[PDB]
Design a protein around this ligand. Structure first.
Ligand SMILES: [Cl-]
Ligand SMILES: [Cl-]
Ligand SMILES: [Mg+2]
Ligand SMILES: [Mg+2]
Lengths: 111, 250, 225, 244, 5, 231, 195, 241, 117, 243, 5
């Protein structure tokens, strides 16, 4: 049968400081025992001082990051350019993820 | 696009008249004369083949139509309206009866279905009533021979004999004097021809007259043998020759 | 077992008269020859309900088509309407039919399988007894058969099915469709399997059965007065 | 567009009346008179066929009195075709109720449904109302013998005796005069015919111009019989009551 | 089940 | 007269009166100016208050980082059309990783307006738009009419007394087109243009609304003390 | 076993006449060469029901095309076949060779495997029996052959396909498509077996 | 007076929009004629190219509906092409469903039923065209069936349509009163076309060049139209006797 | 008659201009904004002394941070209030915060011109 | 009366007055022409310069359909764009099913049927454009002109808009003086002249010339705009002929 | 099964 999911490997790490935060990820993209890329960025600036990474199935991760980036754009349009707080971003991403509850995004998301 | 006429085009006037039904009946009045007579052992329906042009082949235009093997129909009024009603009548005889009960509907119930189609064109959105009155002759095992009239309103009445269209008022008077309950089918045909001659101006022969009977079963018209219970259709359209034979004994 | 055989001036279809529930014979005198139109008949094999339903539906639509066009129906019409219907249902309507008839075009013989595949032949056979029947047809068929020869060949092919197939049995039904003639339907053309007299009458003496209760059933409507 | 040609069949007048309902009632006032009389031991339905002919087959004719089930009948006043649409709907509802509850439908429930359909045609859809007034004659084991009427408005009311169609004003005055509560079916038959005989626009009341029906417990023991009178039976009851 | 030549 | 009941009816001289009436709503609207050089494109809008207690109705809407418009007429209609542009700009970015060309944005607005002029039941849009943008072929200014007609211009003005500003720009054409790599001077020319459409009232700090887009300048709106520099 | 071969004067379609259910030959005189237009024909392999249903729709589409735009190209016929076969690939088992004669383009052959892909080829073979004659056909096919040479090439080719394939057999049917018109050929076992 | 704008009955029991649709029929000012031979059906129509800038090859009111059925239209070209496309679609669909070529009279009935619907349904207007269908039917032989905006249709021994139809009709009527047969007793279609053109010339009292006429011919298993040069050969034969 | 979405020769929507006349007949409502808060006041205008005035609800809560006063055909406001409350709560569900007063107002005003045939 | 208030209503004449009113909108528009040459077609249009503020060569009026069909129209410009959008859908669906690019006569009827459909109902308005279109197919060059009624014919030369009578007269001369035919490069020069001559009916405001062509020899049967030197050469020829 | 060169 056709399997809609894959594993692109990689690892992401988020650490929060007192007046700063870091989001790190390896730049390696793999399929089975093959290396797809030695430099494929996995951690993105999404605007409003928010960094996001969706790690697992690369296709689902790319799609989710796009939808959230789009979500930030329409927040500005519909709310007089209000800065999107990290708590508001987090709640928005939950609704993005749960939307596909019965066809999940096979990704681990850290912002 | 889309049909944006979702509203009735037939409404009640302050006088309680449904204009479009009255105007439809006026169209039927302008129409060529047709009649039906019921005998003890059959029914006859007849009308004039009013040919629009002598170049036109009047045989190709059928005013008298088979609905089922035992039911025939004739009209007065708008021919196109009649043709589409015959198509709908033939189909509804199958979909609403024969495909359920495995037999053809009795005369009164097929009439009831035609009546329903005409009532809907009297109330449904963005349509005008049908501009025809039908005479429907038929036989069925339990009701025997019967003759029905159907009007644009969807109302229907059973008749011993009647006439519709141009010269109906005169024709109905003529039939009242001649009709008795002891008429054989041949007697009814003779009276039908006498009555129809009064309303016809020009040529009066088998080529200008359309006549059909509901009578005895015609095993010669069934198309197959081997099943005793299937004895063939009771509807028969008289030929040009068969009409001319009875015009010599007129 | 159902066969169709083309002859000089027409076509003849035959069938056996057995319907089965698993290994049990439900009807000893079934009617597998169906009238689609007065001069278009077809023999059906497979799911008994499906063959009756599919012939009655197309037979109805063919009658309406005939009235609409003022023309006697054609076999190719019944054939086209049957195959498009059966194809729509991807074989789930298990109707295997041999469609024969005479029309203004001439005499025709077709077979149609449940998945909507049609084929043309001078001799066809369908059903479980098709191989027994086709064995006889392949042995005795020739070009330019007479009416009498085609009936003989058709009924012999059914007999082959009756004797040698457990799915086929009882009598032989025939329908002859000759050009410019009324189709003659010969119900129980042969009766090769008539049951012998029983050794004993099993008619019981009256009062043999123990009865708990008795009552009159009212089948009449509500009465007057 | 299409707005230009819309009659707007479902609007109020400045006086707060429904134009089409009022005009439909005007139509019904020209229809043959139908009378219902409810007695202690049954119900009578009498109705006048509109100017008939000598060549109308009467014994196979039905324009006024229709059977809804074994326990309920209706007398019609208005467009016969419109009535038959509603009658078939009512016949189906009766059988739906029987299928669901395994009991014959109570008379009012059937009446309310038919009345609710008529109401709908006055409030939405932009279609003309049904040009029909019904007299419902029915029996159930809650209220016993019942007479109702419904009109194109979808309003329905219960009655001991009622008329619909032509000369209701005159008919209702005659019924209100001669009707008593302890009245029996045989008496109610006589009243119904005497009322039509006086209100009729025809020269004389004859068998060939009438449809007649009784709902009696005059059925062997604890059950109800519907009797749609044959032409010869209407002729006999006309001689018996002494009108011919 | 059904009836099934 | 008899032919203005709906948008589906032509007049005997082949005019669409419902569209012409929609065009009238724009003339009643407050003045807005548009002009561009080769490097930058500027919108200047006179905002209208209801009274002294009321705010000044916003005239300029951002559609993307590289595109936006000013409105004159029914503000709700500008919201519907600007939302549609935002979506079309957005679709172009997501599907084709491509910033929507200003010319193609015009073509899309035109076709959306047209459908409302040929179908029964609907009505024309009651607003005019000045679309500015910087794409792969440089600076652009568009004028939208709810008839569906969209026009590419060096400069223009729409709304009440717009003819005054339009005449000034027609004289200054050769000067302001050459104002390359100087955003402040291009805005000055836009403020001096809209000034030709003023009567009685003058440009105050909460009255004036300016927007700019250019080579290394995202579409940004200036209101309040941010435009005090140009008064 | 089905094949279409382009030669100098036009194209020739060839096929066997065997229809099977398991190991039983349901029809031994099948006509697998079918008309979708006067000079556009196709060879049917795979499901009998599917290929008949597809062929019937394509004939409808080209009849309506002709009414409006005149005689369709062989490329156009191939495209309509492809459209049905590709868009319904999940539910269809149909391997079709489309062969036609234009006066402008002359003889053209298009093959449509299961996927619904299209391949324009000088000649084409398809069906279960085709596998056994890949070697033979590749070694023996030349471009711009004569009619007699092309009939021999097809007769010898299908003769081998029938010999080795249980699913192929009966008579060899052929249809010749040239400017001259449409010719039907039949070759019986006694003829092609002794080759 | 909105009973004149849509297809509802007038107090006289008339449909004015149907009557006015009949008047649109003559807007082109073109006259058509149809006759039957032994083996063929011929249809001729006047061709008028008033503008020199027009490509005369594209100016036609004769349509090839199916291989067997031809259709000539009397009325504006937009409605003519509407009717043509529909008839082409209906003919193709019929062949697919019922497995034989749609007969001429059956297509005529179908297009007449569609026309009837426009006279009963308000939102649809009648087409301002009269459709003349011609074929050599495999059952009925040479066939002429004509449809109008009322939804009326009938068979014809011969027929004529357009402003001067009555003049052509009486001319044909007079011929069939002499011969006492329902067709042109002629073997070749070439001579049946010559008869058609000759009797149109006599009826209209006008001479024709090759570019003034448009001819359609139905034989067994094909309907086709004649080129200017095919008509020129026909006109030469008429003049030479 | 004439379209519901029709423009007048002056370029105004007839039905909108007519609705503004309905609002003029409505009971008075006043709002005053300060740096310490926003006050909302209404005239109740009971049609009879038997009408229990406290049941007259022309000031309505949308969320904890947004109030609303109405004037005109007050029955029409019920669905507008319903939409406003749904919008305020829905935004809090999606973004875990209070919705801006301007955004809430904009949401209500998007219903306004959703009328036609 | 009232027969002219609703589309799809027949007048007692048998006329659709709403379609005849649409023609008035077309007559009001700028002049557009088409010329059928030896191996292709040329399209030209008059663009009125309302103001100096109009960016020269930017407001393009002529539209391509598929890659081989040119479309120009006079009247309500938006109605023309709507018709071309439909044409592009019809051309796309045809190529999708039949593979070959849509023939010009086939494409003509697709527009024809669509425009005619907007005369069948009162719920829609007729098109306020006459459309001149054509190109090169397998059977050669085709030029068509399509009216609000849905009426279209093939043309040797076509003109519509305010200067149509003037244009038609100039086209009629070319047909008479060139029976053997006109070359693609000649047709471009002549197109320029005819627009300049037809500008006398719009003489108040100065204008901008816009030409396009599809030629089997000059453009490989693809639709291209006339630009740079070849456009200036045609303007120079036109300017010389009026003086 | 189903018929199938
Ligand atoms: Cl096959
Ligand atoms: Cl039909
Ligand atoms: Mg083998
Ligand atoms: Mg109409």
């Amino acid at each position: 049968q056709f399997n809609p999911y894959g594993d692109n490997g990689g690892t992401i790490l988020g650490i929060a400081g007192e007046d700063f935060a870091v989001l790190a990820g390896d730049t390696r993209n793999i399929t089975d025992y093959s290396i797809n890329s030695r430099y494929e960025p996995k951690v993105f600036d999404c605007g409003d001082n928010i960094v996001m990474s969706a790690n697992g199935f690369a296709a689902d991760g790319d799609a989710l990051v796009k939808r959230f980036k789009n979500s930030v754009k329409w927040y500005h349009f519909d709310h007089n350019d209000k800065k999107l707080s990290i708590n508001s971003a987090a709640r928005n991403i939950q609704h993005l993820l749960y939307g596909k509850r019965f066809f999940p995004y096979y990704v681990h998301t850290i912002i | 696009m889309t049909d944006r006429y979702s509203f009735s085009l037939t409404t009640f006037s302050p006088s309680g008249k449904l204009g479009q039904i009255d105007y439809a009946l006026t169209a039927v009045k302008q129409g060529v004369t047709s009649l039906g007579i019921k005998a003890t052992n059959g029914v006859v329906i007849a009308t004039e083949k009013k040919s629009s042009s002598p170049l036109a082949m009047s045989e190709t235009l059928s005013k008298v139509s088979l609905l089922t093997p035992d039911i025939g129909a004739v009209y007065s009024g708008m021919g196109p309206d009649y043709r589409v009603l015959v198509d709908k009548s033939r189909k509804v005889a199958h979909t609403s009866y024969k495909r359920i009960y495995g037999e053809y509907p009795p005369t009164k119930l097929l009439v009831s279905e035609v009546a329903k189609i005409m009532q809907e064109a009297t109330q449904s959105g963005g349509v005008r009533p049908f501009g025809v009155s039908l005479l429907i002759a038929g036989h069925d095992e339990f009701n025997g021979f019967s003759l029905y009239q159907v009007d644009p309103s969807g109302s229907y009445f059973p008749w011993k004999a009647t006439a519709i269209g141009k010269g109906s008022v005169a024709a109905k008077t003529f039939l009242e004097k001649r009709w008795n309950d002891e008429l054989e089918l041949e007697d009814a045909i003779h009276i039908a021809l006498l009555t129809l001659k009064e309303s016809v101006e020009g040529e009066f022969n088998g080529d200008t007259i359309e006549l059909a009977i509901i009578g005895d079963e015609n095993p010669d018209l069934l198309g197959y043998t081997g099943i005793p219970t299937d004895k063939g259709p009771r509807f028969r359209k008289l030929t040009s020759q068969e009409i001319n034979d009875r015009l010599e004994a007129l | 077992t159902i066969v169709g055989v083309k002859f000089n001036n027409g076509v003849v279809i035959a069938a056996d008269t057995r319907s089965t529930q698993g290994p049990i014979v439900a009807d000893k005198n079934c009617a597998k020859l169906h009238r689609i139109s007065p001069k278009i008949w077809c023999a059906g094999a497979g799911t008994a309900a499906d063959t009756e339903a599919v012939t009655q539906l197309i037979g109805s639509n063919i009658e309406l088509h005939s009235l609409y066009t003022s023309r006697e129906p054609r076999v190719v019409s019944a054939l086209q309407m049957l195959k498009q219907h059966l194809f729509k249902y991807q074989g789930h309507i298990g109707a295997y039919l041999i469609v024969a008839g005479v029309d203004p075009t001439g005499s025709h013989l077709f077979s149609i399988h449940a998945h909507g595949s049609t084929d043309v032949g001078y001799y066809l056979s369908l059903g479980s007894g098709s191989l027994a029947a086709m064995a006889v047809l392949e042995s005795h068929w020739k070009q330019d058969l007479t009416k009498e020869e085609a009936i003989k060949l058709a009924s012999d092919a059914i007999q082959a099915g009756i004797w040698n197939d457990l799915g086929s049995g009882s009598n032989v039904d025939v329908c002859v469709m000759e050009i410019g003639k009324d189709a003659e339907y010969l119900r129980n053309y042969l009766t090769p399997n008539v049951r012998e007299e029983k050794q004993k009458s099993y008619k019981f003496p009256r009062g043999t059965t123990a009865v708990l209760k008795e009552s009159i059933v009212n089948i009449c409507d509500i009465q007057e007065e | 567009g299409s707005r230009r040609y819309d009659s707007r069949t479902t609007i109020f007048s400045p006086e707060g009346r429904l134009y089409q309902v009022e005009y439909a009632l005007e139509s019904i006032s020209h229809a043959g008179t139908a009378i219902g009389i409810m007695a202690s031991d049954g119900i009578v339905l009498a109705a006048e066929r509109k100017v008939t002919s000598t060549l109308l087959e009467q014994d196979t004719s039905t324009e006024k009195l229709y059977k809804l089930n074994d326990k309920i009948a209706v007398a019609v006043a208005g467009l016969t075709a419109d009535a038959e649409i509603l009658i078939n709907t009512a016949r189906i509802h009766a059988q739906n109720y029987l299928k669901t509850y395994n009991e014959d439908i109570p008379v009012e429930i059937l009446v309310r449904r038919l009345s609710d359909i008529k109401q709908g045609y006055t409030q939405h859809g932009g279609l003309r109302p049904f040009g029909v007034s019904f007299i419902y004659a029915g029996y159930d084991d809650r209220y016993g013998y019942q007479l109702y009427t419904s009109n194109p408005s979808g309003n329905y009311t219960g009655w001991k005796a009622i008329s619909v169609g032509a000369n209701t004003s005159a008919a209702q005055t005659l019924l209100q005069m001669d009707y008593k509560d302890d009245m029996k079916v045989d008496d109610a038959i006589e009243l119904a015919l005497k009322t039509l005989s006086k209100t009729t626009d025809s020269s004389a009341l004859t068998y060939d111009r009438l449809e007649f029906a009784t709902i009696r417990k005059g059925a062997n023991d604890g059950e109800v019989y519907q009797k749609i009178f044959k032409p010869q039976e209407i002729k006999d009851i006309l001689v018996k009551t002494g009108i011919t | 089940x059904f009836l099934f030549x | 007269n008899n032919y203005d009941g709906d948008t589906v009816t032509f007049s005997p001289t082949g005019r669409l009166f419902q569209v012409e009436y929609a065009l009238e709503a724009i003339k009643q609207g407050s003045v807005t100016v548009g002009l561009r050089s080769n490097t930058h494109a500027v919108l200047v809008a006179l905002k209208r208050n209801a009274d002294e207690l009321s705010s000044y109705q916003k005239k300029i809407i951002k559609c993307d980082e590289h595109m936006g418009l000013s409105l004159a007429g029914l503000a709700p209609d500008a919201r519907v059309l600007s939302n549609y542009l935002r979506q079309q700009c957005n679709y172009s970015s997501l599907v084709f990783n491509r910033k929507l060309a200003v010319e193609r944005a015009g073509h899309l607005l035109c076709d959306k307006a047209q459908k409302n002029t040929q179908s029964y039941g609907g009505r024309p849009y009651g607003v005019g738009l000045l679309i500015i943008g910087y794409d792969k072929s440089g600076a652009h200014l568009l004028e939208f009419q709810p008839s569906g007609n969209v026009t590419e211009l060096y400069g223009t003005a729409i709304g009440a007394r717009s003819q005054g500003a339009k005449t000034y720009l027609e004289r200054t054409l050769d000067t302001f087109i050459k104002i390359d790599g100087n955003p402040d001077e291009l805005i000055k020319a836009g403020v001096e243009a809209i000034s030709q459409s003023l009567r009685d009232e003058s440009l105050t700090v909460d009255n004036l609304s300016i927007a700019i887009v250019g080579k290394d300048t995202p579409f940004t709106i200036y209101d309040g003390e941010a435009v005090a520099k140009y008064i | 076993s089905i094949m279409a071969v382009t030669f100098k004067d036009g194209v020739i379609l060839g096929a066997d006449s065997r229809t099977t259910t398991g190991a039983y030959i349901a029809n031994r005189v099948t006509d697998k060469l079918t008309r979708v237009h006067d000079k556009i024909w196709c060879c049917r392999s795979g499901s009998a029901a599917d290929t008949q249903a597809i062929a019937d729709i394509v004939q409808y589409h080209l009849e309506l095309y002709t009414s409006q735009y005149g005689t369709p190209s062989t490329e156009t016929a191939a495209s309509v076949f492809k459209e049905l076969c590709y868009e319904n690939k999940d539910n269809l088992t149909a391997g079709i060779i489309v062969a036609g004669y234009d006066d402008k383009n002359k003889g053209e052959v298009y093959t449509i495997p299961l996927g619904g892909s299209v391949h324009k080829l000088p000649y084409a073979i398809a069906g279960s029996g085709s596998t056994f004659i890949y070697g033979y056909c590749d070694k023996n096919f030349r471009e711009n052959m004569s009619k007699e040479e092309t009939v021999d090439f097809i007769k010898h080719s299908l003769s081998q396909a029938i010999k080795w394939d249980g699913s192929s057999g009966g008579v060899i049917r052929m249809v010749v498509l040239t400017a001259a018109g449409v010719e039907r050929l039949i070759f019986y076992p006694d003829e092609y077996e002794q080759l | 007076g909105y009973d004149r704008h849509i297809t509802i009955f007038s107090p006289e029991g008339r449909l004015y929009q149907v009557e006015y649709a009949f008047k649109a029929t003559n807007q082109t000012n073109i006259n058509s004629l149809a006759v039957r031979g032994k083996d063929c059906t011929v249809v001729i129509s006047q061709k008028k190219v008033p503008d020199k800038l027009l490509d005369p090859t594209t100016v036609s009111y004769i349509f090839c509906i199916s291989r067997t059925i031809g259709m000539v239209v009397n009325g504006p070209i937009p409605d003519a092409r509407n009717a043509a496309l529909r008839a082409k679609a209906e003919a193709a669909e019929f062949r697919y469903k019922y497995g034989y070529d749609m007969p001429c009279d059956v297509l005529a009935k179908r297009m007449a039923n569609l026309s009837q619907i426009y006279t009963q349904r308000a939102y649809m207007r009648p087409l301002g065209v009269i459709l003349t269908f011609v074929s050599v039917d495999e059952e009925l032989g040479p066939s002429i069936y004509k449809t109008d905006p009322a939804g009326y249709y009938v068979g014809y021994k011969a027929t004529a349509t357009g402003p001067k139809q009555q003049e052509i009709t009486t001319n044909l009527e007079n011929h069939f009163k002499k011969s006492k047969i329902d067709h042109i007793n002629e073997e070749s279609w070439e001579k049946v076309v010559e008869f058609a053109i000759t009797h149109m010339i006599d009826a209209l009292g006008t001479e024709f060049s090759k570019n003034d006429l448009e001819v359609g011919v139905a034989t067994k298993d094909k309907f086709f139209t004649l080129s200017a040069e095919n008509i020129e050969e026909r006109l030469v034969a008429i003049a030479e006797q | 008659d004439r379209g519901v979405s029709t423009f007048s020769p002056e370029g105004r929507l007839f039905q909108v201009e007519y609705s503004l006349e309905a609002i003029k007949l409505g009971s008075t409502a006043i709002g005053i904004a300060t740096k310490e808060g926003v006050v909302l006041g209404v005239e109740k205008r009971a049609t009879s002394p038997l009408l229990e005035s406290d049941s007259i609800e022309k000031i309505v809560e949308i969320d904890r941070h947004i109030g609303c006063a109405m004037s005109g055909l007050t029955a029409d406001a019920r669905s507008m209030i319903e939409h406003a409350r749904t919008a305020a709560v829905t935004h809090n569900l999606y973004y875990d915060e209070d919705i801006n007063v301007e955004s809430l107002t904009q949401s209500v005003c998007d219903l306004a011109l959703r009328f036609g045939e | 009366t009232g027969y002219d208030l609703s589309n799809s209503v027949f007048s007692p004449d048998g006329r659709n007055f709403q379609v005849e009113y649409a023609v008035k909108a077309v007559e009001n528009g700028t002049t557009s022409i088409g010329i059928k040459c030896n191996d292709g077609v040329v399209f030209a249009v008059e663009k009125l310069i309302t103001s100096k503020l109009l960016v020269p060569q930017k407001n393009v009026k002529i539209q391509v359909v598929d890659r081989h069909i040119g479309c120009v129209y006079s009247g309500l410009i938006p109605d023309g764009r709507h018709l071309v959008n439909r044409g592009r859908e019809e051309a796309a669906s045809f190529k999708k099913l039949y593979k070959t690019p849509i023939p010009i006569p086939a494409f003509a009827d697709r527009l024809g049927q669509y425009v005619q459909a907007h005369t069948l109902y009162n719920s829609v308005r007729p098109f306020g454009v006459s459309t001149i279109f054509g190109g090169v197919d397998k059977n050669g060059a085709h030029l068509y002109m399509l009216e609000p009624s849905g009426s279209y014919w093939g043309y040797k030369g076509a003109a519509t808009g305010k200067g149509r009578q003037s244009a038609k007269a100039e086209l009629e001369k070319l047909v008479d003086h060139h029976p053997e035919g006109l070359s693609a490069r000649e047709a471009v020069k002549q197109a320029a002249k005819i627009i300049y001559l037809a500008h006398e009916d719009n003489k108040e405001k100065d204008f901008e010339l816009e030409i396009s062509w599809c030629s089997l020899s000059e453009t490989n049967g693809l639709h291209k705009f006339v630009k740079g030197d070849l456009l200036q050469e045609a303007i120079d020829f036109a300017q010389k002929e009026i003086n």
